[PDB]
Amino acid sequence: AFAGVLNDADIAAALEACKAADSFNHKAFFAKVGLTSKSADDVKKAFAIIDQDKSGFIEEDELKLFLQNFKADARALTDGETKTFLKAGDSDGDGKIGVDEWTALVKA
Ligand SMILES: [Ca+2]
Ligand SMILES: [Ca+2]
């Protein structure tokens, strides 16, 4: 749980909602978890947390573990949920998400 970035109560509620396999929706999640309200600074901080290996991009393997960044015992996304999420953010087609594609994804 992003203790110094997001309210723990909104995370619980966002995780509760996409518990069933294939029920994940990123725009629903971002809205519920409270990330959409955030400024460019906080959105960049979120990016860094998700970019587990600090390569500058969120690769497919990290995107599949997306929920675990909020709650350690959260489920992994299905390959179907991962491909959809990937395809929505990856504006340039290199197979990964950079900080600008993330910012747009979170905000638009
Ligand atoms: Ca990475
Ligand atoms: Ca990309």
Q: Specify binding-site residues.
A: 51, 53, 55, 57, 59, 62, 90, 92, 94, 96, 101
What six digits make up the tokens of 23? 């029920």
CA 108 to centroid of ligand 1, rounded, Å: 22
Q: How far apart are CA 94 and CA 56, in angstroms?
A: 13
Q: Which two tokens stand for residue 28?
A: 């629903």
- Say if residues 49 and 69 touch (Cβ distance below 8 Å): yes
The structure was resolved to a resolution in Å of 1.9
CA 48–ligand 1 middle distance (angstroms) = 9
End-to-end CA distance of the chain: 23
Residues β-bridged to residue 58: 97
For each of the domains in the chain, give its residue range(s) and CATH number, in order of start. 1-108 (1.10.238.10)
- The angle, 0 to 180 degrees and rounded to 10, between the axes of the packed helices 99-107 and 79-89 is 100
How far is Cα 81 from Cα 92, in angstroms, rounded to an integer?
19
- Cα–Cα distance measured from residue 102 to residue 86, given in angstroms and rounded to the nearest whole number: 10
User: What ligand is nearest to the CA atom of residue 95?
Assistant: 2
**Experimental approach:** X-ray
Rounded Cα–Cα distance for residues 39 and 33 (Å) = 14
